[PDB]
Amino acid sequence: FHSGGVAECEGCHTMHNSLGGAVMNSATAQFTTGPMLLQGATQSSSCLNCHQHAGDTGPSSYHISTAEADMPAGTAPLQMTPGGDFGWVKKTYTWNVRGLNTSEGERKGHNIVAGDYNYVADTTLTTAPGGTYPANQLHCSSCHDPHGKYRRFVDGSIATTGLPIKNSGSYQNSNDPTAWGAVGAYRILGGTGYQPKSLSGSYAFANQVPAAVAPSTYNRTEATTQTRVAYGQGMSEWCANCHTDIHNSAYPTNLRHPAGNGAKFGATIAGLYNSYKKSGDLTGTQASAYLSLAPFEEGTADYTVLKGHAKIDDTALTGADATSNVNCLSCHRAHASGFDSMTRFNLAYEFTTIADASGNSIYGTDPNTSSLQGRSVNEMTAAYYGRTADKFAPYQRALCNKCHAKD
Amino acid sequence: FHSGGVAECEGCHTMHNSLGGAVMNSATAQFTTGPMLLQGATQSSSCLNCHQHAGDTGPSSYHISTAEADMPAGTAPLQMTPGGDFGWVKKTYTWNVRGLNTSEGERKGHNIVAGDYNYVADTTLTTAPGGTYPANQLHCSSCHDPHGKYRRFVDGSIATTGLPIKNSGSYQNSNDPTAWGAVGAYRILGGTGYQPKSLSGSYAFANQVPAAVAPSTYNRTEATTQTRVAYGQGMSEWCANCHTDIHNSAYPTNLRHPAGNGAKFGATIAGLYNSYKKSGDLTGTQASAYLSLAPFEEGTADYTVLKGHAKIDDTALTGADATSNVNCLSCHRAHASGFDSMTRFNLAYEFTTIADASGNSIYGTDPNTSSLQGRSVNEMTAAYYGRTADKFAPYQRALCNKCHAKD
Ligand code: HEC
Numbered sequence: 001f002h003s004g005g006v007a008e009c010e011g012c013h014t015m016h017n018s019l020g021g022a023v024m025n026s027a028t029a030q031f032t033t034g035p036m037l038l039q040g041a042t043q044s045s046s047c048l049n050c051h052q053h054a055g056d057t058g059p060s061s062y063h064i065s066t067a068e069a070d071m072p073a074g075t076a077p078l079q080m081t082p083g084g085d086f087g088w089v090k091k092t093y094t095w096n097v098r099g100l101n102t103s104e105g106e107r108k109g110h111n112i113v114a115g116d117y118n119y120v121a122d123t124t125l126t127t128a129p130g131g132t133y134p135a136n137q138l139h140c141s142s143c144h145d146p147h148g149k150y151r152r153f154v155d156g157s158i159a160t161t162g163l164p165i166k167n168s169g170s171y172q173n174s175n176d177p178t179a180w181g182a183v184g185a186y187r188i189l190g191g192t193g194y195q196p197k198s199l200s201g202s203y204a205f206a207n208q209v210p211a212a213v214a215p216s217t218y219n220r221t222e223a224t225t226q227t228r229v230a231y232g233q234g235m236s237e238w239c240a241n242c243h244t245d246i247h248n249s250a251y252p253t254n255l256r257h258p259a260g261n262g263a264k265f266g267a268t269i270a271g272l273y274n275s276y277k278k279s280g281d282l283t284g285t286q287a288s289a290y291l292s293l294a295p296f297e298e299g300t301a302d303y304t305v306l307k308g309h310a311k312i313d314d315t316a317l318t319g320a321d322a323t324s325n326v327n328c329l330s331c332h333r334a335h336a337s338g339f340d341s342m343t344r345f346n347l348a349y350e351f352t353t354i355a356d357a358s359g360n361s362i363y364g365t366d367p368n369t370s371s372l373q374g375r376s377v378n379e380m381t382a383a384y385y386g387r388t389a390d391k392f393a394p395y396q397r398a399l400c401n402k403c404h405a406k407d
Numbered sequence: 408f409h410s411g412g413v414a415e416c417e418g419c420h421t422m423h424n425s426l427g428g429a430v431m432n433s434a435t436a437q438f439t440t441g442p443m444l445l446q447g448a449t450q451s452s453s454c455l456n457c458h459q460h461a462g463d464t465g466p467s468s469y470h471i472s473t474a475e476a477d478m479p480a481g482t483a484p485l486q487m488t489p490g491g492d493f494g495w496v497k498k499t500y501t502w503n504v505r506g507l508n509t510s511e512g513e514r515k516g517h518n519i520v521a522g523d524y525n526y527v528a529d530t531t532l533t534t535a536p537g538g539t540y541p542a543n544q545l546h547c548s549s550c551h552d553p554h555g556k557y558r559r560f561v562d563g564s565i566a567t568t569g570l571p572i573k574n575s576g577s578y579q580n581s582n583d584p585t586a587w588g589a590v591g592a593y594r595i596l597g598g599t600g601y602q603p604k605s606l607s608g609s610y611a612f613a614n615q616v617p618a619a620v621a622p623s624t625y626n627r628t629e630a631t632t633q634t635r636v637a638y639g640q641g642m643s644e645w646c647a648n649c650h651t652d653i654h655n656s657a658y659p660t661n662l663r664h665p666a667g668n669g670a671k672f673g674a675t676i677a678g679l680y681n682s683y684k685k686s687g688d689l690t691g692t693q694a695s696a697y698l699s700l701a702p703f704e705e706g707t708a709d710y711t712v713l714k715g716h717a718k719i720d721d722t723a724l725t726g727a728d729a730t731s732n733v734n735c736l737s738c739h740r741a742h743a744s745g746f747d748s749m750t751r752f753n754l755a756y757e758f759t760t761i762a763d764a765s766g767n768s769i770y771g772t773d774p775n776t777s778s779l780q781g782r783s784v785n786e787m788t789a790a791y792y793g794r795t796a797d798k799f800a801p802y803q804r805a806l807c808n809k810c811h812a813k814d
Pocket residue numbers: 010013014015016017018019020021022
């Protein structure tokens with residue numbers, strides 16, 4: 001559809017809301033289209049009309065959210081992207097240990113605005129924490145560039161114009177940009193000047209598009225092999241481009257957890273990342289010890305090495321480096337994850353698992369517990385992207401001790 | 408929260424000092440956390456933000472200090488732990504018998520550093536008496552391990568890694584360490600190599616974690632039954648691990664009061680411990696004669712016997728043994744006690760009580776006396792953990808004649 005840049009130009013837009021007499025999208029009546037001539041009531045329904053295919057038997061191809069008619073109150077959202085399902089924003093859990101605990105769905109993700117799909121905007125976070133960016137204006141075109149104008153050339157520069165776009169910058173089986181044609185940006189997100197016309201403020205992006213290489217055929221379970229995304233240089237600065245006061249390139253002279261190009265691993269931290277396998281099983285290696293729940297920047301922009309370190313198979317499970325950096329997106333899965341702060345981690349209880357009597361592991365036996373937190377064992381399994389009770393310690397503590405071994 | 412080891416990982420730390428837009432701890436402004444990313448101005452406010460619940464009607468659950476808004480100048484701190492309240496460090500008493508006497512609150516406890524709770528560091532004791540350990544650096548993580556790394560295995564060995572942690576080593580209704588999972592240390596204190604990263608000296612712990620079994624539901628008055636803590640082997644050596652020159656395993660070849668594994672009771676001393684009930688009432692027995700104000704090591708590490716001799720009820724009031732040792736923590740309650748040298752004893756006046764005219768006992772009638780020492784009778788009662796004028800002799804001398812009968 002997109003193929004690096006702008007797409008089939010009626011795929012998202014519509015001109016008269018009519019094609020063969022029929023309404024092109026029933027959210028608005030015929031002979032009136034909607035906002036910015038799009039197919040939908042908002043700027044995100046024109047994304048969610050072929051993304052979010054209603055009716056799924058697993059994470060299929062490129063979809064990023066699951067229809068509400070597919071999920072009851074007993075199952076998890078059924079698409080496993082590196083961004084995660086937006087269906088997690090409509091999950092409010094109530095478990096009754098020593099009182100009650102409400103883990104509402106507002107805190108689990110970016111509440112995009114989509115009236116026809118009941119994606120209500122975030123009510124508690126009225127603006128972005130860090131900047132002045134509104135949450136009643138956040139759409140899918142608010143951080144992605146829907147036209148995909150941003151290119152990359154043979155010298156790695158990124159420009160809004162010049163040589164035309166031939167394919168996507170992600171997907172390691174892509175092509176290199178030539179002297180006659182450019183390759184589009186990684187996951188066509190805007191940068192260094194991007195602002196939608198629908199915004200009436202000084203909300204211009206001032207950070208470049210993040211260099212990374214995602215793997216093709218990425219919607220998968222991670223019970224067998226892990227999804228390695230290259231995450232090269234500018235992911236933390238791009239997340240800082242709208243959450244201004246959050247990133248931290250200098251630790252400590254800000255007293256925030258470091259995230260940026262200057263947020264290097266120590267030689268101590270990189271050894272603790274490579275050693276950690278389970279709780280107390282500090283026997284890991286440089287190679288064959290990687291966790292997608294805590295990635296790192298590997299802070300170069302050499303796309304040959306980035307396509308080398310981007311593989312669906314386990315042939316590229318190299319661990320940390322002393323010169324490796326810290327992502328924003330190390331914790332905080334990008335779209336939504338279902339863990340009350342959009343993080344990849346269960347941080348509301350002290351150990352993420354339960355050992356059943358003869359000591360193998362489970363996630364629990366009952367939603368009304370403190371360890372499992374008002375959900376099924378299948379929903380906690382799918383929240384860890386199909387990672388079952390094994391690959392973890394039986395009483396494994398919170399997974400953000402990966403690169404400190406504070407166990 | 409902790410459950411033997413490291414906890415809900417945002418329970419003490421914070422990453423951006425923001426959650427739902429609001430500041431996670433108002434001692435530091437938003438988008439800057441504090442020292443070591445903790446919730447508070449110091450490393451102890453991140454302990455005292457859910458410990459020390461402001462507003463109490465007695466010793467409730469697990470709290471260790473009382474808020475200053477709960478105590479006037481007429482009442483005592485209201486939590487009775489085996490460590491004692493840190494509120495006792497802010498009690499300066501002035502009684503005017505033949506001049507005046509100032510019993511300042513610096514001498515009554517470990518002055519931890521907490522700027523938001525006005526716990527000022529100790530000014531007279533600049534370092535630890537016995538070592539070179541500073542008092543301007545003492546925090547709750549300075550003698551406890553805040554991550555609780557130290558484990559114990561099925562063979563009683565203690566290691567920093569190996570099998571993971573499932574529960575606390577204290578609390579006699581705990582579980583035994585299995586071949587698949589370890590039990591955390593007694594009262595998660597560090598040992599044999601513990602040193603915080605915030606210290607820039609050679610202050611490494613070289614003594615093991617003390618073997619003991621504390622009783623569950625311990626915050627209580629002791630007007631009815633006593634709180635028996637097992638206190639097994641290494642409490643005196645662990646207190647020696649930072650107060651180096653103080654402990655004494657060989658008496659006399661040091662001329663200090665003995666405290667250690669080699670500081671055994673004599674056959675004379677163990678008989679004097681069992682005989683002492685009150686002043687002059689030397690009629691006690693082996694069984695049914697125990698005082699929590701003067702415990703002993705019972706110097707084994709057999710945790711079955713230690714959980715046997717750890718009971719809130721009076722079913723385990725066995726007295727001394729000829730092979731029993733002497734704690735540090737026999738005198739000197741651990742956190743703070745309010746007796747000008749952190750001891751469990753009133754050692755500033757010759758008899759701890761007053762007989763009122765027809766000879767029953769009181770603690771006094773007036774703070775401006777020598778027997779009651781500038782405090783209420785209720786504050787002296789709560790300083791003895793709710794022990795009233797009875798259970799004592801009417802003119803009972805200083806309680807450290809328990810195991811000598813030097814009355
Ligand atoms: C100028 C006054 C007119 C009139 C009378 C019509 N158009 Fe358009 N049109 C455009 C595109 C891309 C489509 C197909 C997809 C869509 O509707 O968005 C159409 C469709 C129609 C139809 C119906 C055809 C059908 O199959 O039902 C009719 C009757 C029609 N148009 C009439 C594109 C454009 C424009 C592109 C910017 C312009 C201008 C117009 N049309 C203008 C007109």
